[PDB]
């Protein structure tokens, strides 16, 4: 804190509580006793722990009928309406689409739909599999998880 | 995540002051004096909750003593008479009979008086 280097008054005689700085944590405008600093919050998950969690989540997704397997999910044009209509016939208006080699026009189609995301199998996180109401995984992408888990 | 304690402190202090209503002066107005008045009131209540049972038995015994002495013997001989006659009536009920129905207590003393 700025300033506060000198003793505000002599130790004895004045009748006031002894003080050593006007920037004491007891004083208004004083420093913070145990002031916060930037810190790292990332933890270590063991490689097998991360793999095991994704195995547990995918297995649970099947058990509660939240995984949807499709042969392929491609869009002819980068149109939001086309994918919104394809999700309706798939009975998943809000879902997480997982495919290998996410298309450059399927990305744009889903980039506006509110509760919809399209991810590569190699950039799927444990939170995404749980947050979304359904998961539409292609058969090709399901094989990737079969090998990587 | 700074936490400001003003709201919780306000209703916490208000809770103590609400419990100090009717107290004189600072004991019902300023928290520092009211908090130890509320604690002291609770200490008195806990002890006076034992003393109540202790004080009403003194009241019953004195009422019974007056009733027995009105017609015949004393309390010390009355309780002995009831004990020998296997009469289980508590001192609470006896003091109520003495103070509210003197005919029954007169008949009740006779049963104790014939037993000694």
């Amino acid at each position: 804190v700025s300033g506060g280097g000198i003793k505000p008054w002599r130790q004895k005689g004045t009748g006031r509580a002894r003080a050593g700085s006007i920037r004491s944590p007891i004083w208004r405008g004083g420093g913070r006793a145990f002031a916060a600093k930037p810190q790292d919050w990332s933890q270590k998950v063991n490689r097998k722990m991360y793999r095991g969690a994704m195995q547990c989540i995918l297995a649970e997704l099947i058990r509660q009928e939240r995984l949807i397997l499709v042969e392929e999910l491609t869009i002819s044009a980068p149109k939001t309406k086309e994918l919104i209509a394809k999700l309706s016939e798939l009975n998943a208006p809000r879902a997480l689409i997982i495919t290998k080699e996410v298309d450059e026009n399927l990305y744009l189609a889903a980039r506006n739909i509110p509760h919809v995301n399209v991810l590569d199998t190699s950039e799927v996180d444990p939170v995404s599999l749980i947050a979304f109401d359904k998961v539409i995984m292609s058969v090709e992408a399901a094989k990737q998880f079969e090998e990587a888990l | 995540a700074r936490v400001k304690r003003g709201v919780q402190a306000n209703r916490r202090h208000k809770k103590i002051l609400k419990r100090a209503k009717g107290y004189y002066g600072a004991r019902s107005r300023v928290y520092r004096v009211a908090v130890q008045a509320v604690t002291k009131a609770g200490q008195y209540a806990y002890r006076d909750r034992r003393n109540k049972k202790r004080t009403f038995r003194r009241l019953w015994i004195a009422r019974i003593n007056a009733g027995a002495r009105l017609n015949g013997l004393s309390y010390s001989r009355f309780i002995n008479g009831m004990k020998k006659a296997n009469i289980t009536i508590d001192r609470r009920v006896l003091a109520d009979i003495a103070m509210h129905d003197a005919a029954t207590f007169g008949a009740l003393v006779e049963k104790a008086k014939a037993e000694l």
């Binding site: 989540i57 649970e60 509660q64 444990p126 599999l129 749980i130 947050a131 | -």
Partner: protein, 144 residues
């Protein structure tokens, strides 16, 4: 998982941390378990490893003894039960290094009788104990 709501730590996994000086009911009010006025109750107190309050500490009433050998820090002992990490049949110093059995800076190795081998091995430049030698050749191994 079901949802981000019903994800629980599996009771016993988490324990509440202790906060000192938060009132009478918490069990740590007014002192933090520090006791009363004393050196160990003060802000910067410590136990000071190696101190008995003034009498010469135990590590100074006793004498220093021995010397450190540089050979001992480059000689690794190898167990019979660790040999399953070796690729192939030869067991040498360089072969123990690529199996991550011994440190890369170890110069020589010794094979002792701890577990039991499962396949025939050929030991070239490593010393083998008498008990380990008979266990090696009982599985068809050799020492050269």
């Amino acid at each position: 998982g079901l949802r981000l709501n019903e994800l629980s730590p599996g009771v016993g996994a988490k324990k509440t941390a202790q906060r000192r000086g938060r009132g009478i009911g918490s069990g740590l009010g007014k002192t933090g378990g520090r006791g009363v006025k004393g050196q160990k109750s003060r802000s910067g107190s410590s136990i000071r490893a190696g101190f008995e309050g003034g009498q010469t500490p135990l590590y100074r009433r006793l004498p220093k003894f021995g010397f450190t050998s540089k050979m001992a820090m480059t000689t690794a002992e190898v167990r019979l039960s660790e040999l399953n990490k070796v690729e192939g049949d030869v067991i040498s110093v360089a072969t123990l290094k690529t199996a991550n059995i011994i440190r890369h800076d170890m110069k020589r190795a010794r094979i002792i009788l701890s577990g039991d081998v499962t396949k025939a091995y050929t030991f070239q430049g490593v010393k083998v104990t008498k008990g380990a030698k008979q266990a090696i050749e009982a599985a068809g191994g050799s020492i050269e």
